[PDB]
Amino acid sequence: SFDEALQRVGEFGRFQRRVFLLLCLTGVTFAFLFVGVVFLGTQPDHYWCRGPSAAALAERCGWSPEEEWNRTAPASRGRCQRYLLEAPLVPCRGGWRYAQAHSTIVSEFDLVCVNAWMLDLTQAILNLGFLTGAFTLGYAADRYGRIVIYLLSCLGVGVTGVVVAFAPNFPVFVIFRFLQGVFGKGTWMTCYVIVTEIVGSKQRRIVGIVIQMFFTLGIIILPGIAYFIPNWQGIQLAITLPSFLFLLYYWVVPESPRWLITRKKGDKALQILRRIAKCNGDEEVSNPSFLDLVRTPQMRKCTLILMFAWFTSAVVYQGLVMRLGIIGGNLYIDFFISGVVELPGALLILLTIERLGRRLPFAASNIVAGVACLVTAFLPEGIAWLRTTVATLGRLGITMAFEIVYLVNSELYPTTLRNFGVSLCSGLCDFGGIIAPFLLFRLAAVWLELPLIIFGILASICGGLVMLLPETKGIALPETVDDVEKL
Template identity: 50%
Template structure:
């Protein structure tokens, strides 16, 4: 009985039909960028200081420059406002009082030799920024700075919960139905974020957006890999992820042009409306899913349309073919199977840790670069550009060198680059950016490789469950990483990089404990997995030399 892959060999494995589907779904992958890393621009933290009533009037009366005003009226001002007191405390002084000296205003208020008490910023803050963000609109600084962490954690919590439910919807009701419903829900959430007036509702809607957006991206990934032939599946999957990198560049350019977060949110949401209209009419359902549901006639109709658009003629003996559903009842997937045997247990724990580490380092480096103190837009651009050579290196090496060593090296490079970045002095910012970009390239490679290696280390009957469980640690990492970055920088600006170093180096070492999957048949049973590490790779040709030895009496 021929399979769908056999038919695709005749009607086109990656021809015009598949290329068109691939292109429009790559637009969806790129549109996922603002949801995943939007906190960099939606929640950018400008330089800030307490607003003190009367300071502006006093400065105007005394003819101070801005720097003189800050030196006289901001606690512990060092020219940059880098200390906690300069950002989160103000002098408890009445700047509107009569007789305030222009040369020594504090001394004239409290007397020479006296210490001026400090007070919280009861009247708000002054932000040195031409635009607006969540931080400037809701004053998410100082004692309320944790609320920015919660904003990003909420969307990752939505990823965690939604990926399980959306995966069920995609398997139960189809890839196209799942895609359309999640796109629509994502549009609604994106537009609501533009208009809701309170921080609490923003966090709630951001969580709801997380519930649907990652599932939307995943449904697109599944669909695009299910309409191409097996020879193109891995390449298409990697390029679909690379489209996300293109989205980073576009998002950076839009954010530079629109520095106001609500207008930016609206701008990145509206194009998705056009995607939805196009997908409703032109996007096909996955023929593989239709076959799995016993809807052979609908599947063959799509295959026939595929052949027509590809200008191929489907052989007549395929036209009335009936697919038989495989018997999947012999082995029921169970969570306990993931840790039941030693090799399965080792694979599961290492994969879970690597999913967690990839998420923490990838999102963490993006967030840390956003608060590094340089040009936010240029730094983001540089770090996004390195994702393209990362994808190229993967495509070149995985079928030549294998999976394990490039994967391990990418983690080790990411960890080492984070350490070097932390040790470089702040005044050599350009060098810190270069090493941070190297780390970003390394973790991008690791992130993309864990996606497909995960599928190669589990038997068929439990493969989807294994990927779902292991990748859920990616979302757990996403929930934690805002607190790692934004809280630890208050202790030492580069302390998060030290944490990333430890995580990355451990991940690289653990990858070396996994079996190599290059050139191996996918395992079908748990027994196959247990024997995986003992399977020898394809044997190289050997030359045997027969050596004649002298005989001694």
């Protein structure tokens, strides 16, 4: 019955186009949130401990900070040792000074030497927050209305961003960044699911891949907003500012029709369909359960393969990032070039899905990335100019795999009884992101260029496995427990 309703009103409309723009703006905001952390708090040029006698001397003679470095520098980067006039001398753990004028997270929180480890621990905590946020917000968003959970998640993102902009100390900052990652994950999941649902099953690939376009576009935009405003709090406030305007949507963006019409209310769905028409014209799901998500062989196998694919994609991308290094000799130029280069791969995704399907591009991209990383592992010493070129095609392949697998993940799961297994799989990807550095170091300890080989076989076997997905095209979206009957 819903199909016919889509035929009478649906597909592409003026209001639907406006809502699509709104939700892809939500996606680009999530892109800023996810990625801006790498830019926040870059390592300063020079940091060092200064003594109380040294501080008095410097303030009396008026040394410039740069000359203070040039004269006071020990050893012969940032030295972890200081001169103690009160000779070779012991390390210092207080009174640090940073020469770089640009404000950074490490300057404020004093993450240097051994303390430099919690700089990466902040990324670890944010990624764990993404994990737990997917894990909880799946159930939270399926329990209540999708749009309601989206709005509360946007409010949470805004409030948490504001509070972390003015966080006084490191522990409160870390816990609030955790509580901000949870809400950002909620926003991204709800927004993508609702924008995918509101569109009919003809240009659904277009809507998904174009909101991915907007995520990449946000990655592209990030260097500009990062470079124009120096102050760290400035970047954080700028990143979290759109969340409030997005809270402001409210009545403009309606609830997704299909989720509403599950025998629960019915009349409200008819009213909202009449509203969107304008002049152009079972047991209640209750709450999801993990056993039901794992129940039945087809559902179990699809879920496990999807989690494996997410994990492999995350770990291979993390492994390849270190080998990519710096391109062009400047961070801004490198980041901008990578962001721009992302786009042609995504347009290729669009056209190749349009011609035949999704599973073949998925497998091809995964195999391409695996072969690229394996070749980088086995390359003979030399080709320094060509060192950059390799492992870049692999990165494009991994990003393509991310986009295709995320769209397929949205497509496969039954919307009415969705536990946000999309969110749970993304959380398993997040878990892979957390453990990736430790596993990478452990593998690299025994022999160098070993982790690249391991990830090459992992990506190859993932590309072999992903062929097993059904990948039915034009079947619209499964309802309730009908997911089994596509096969």
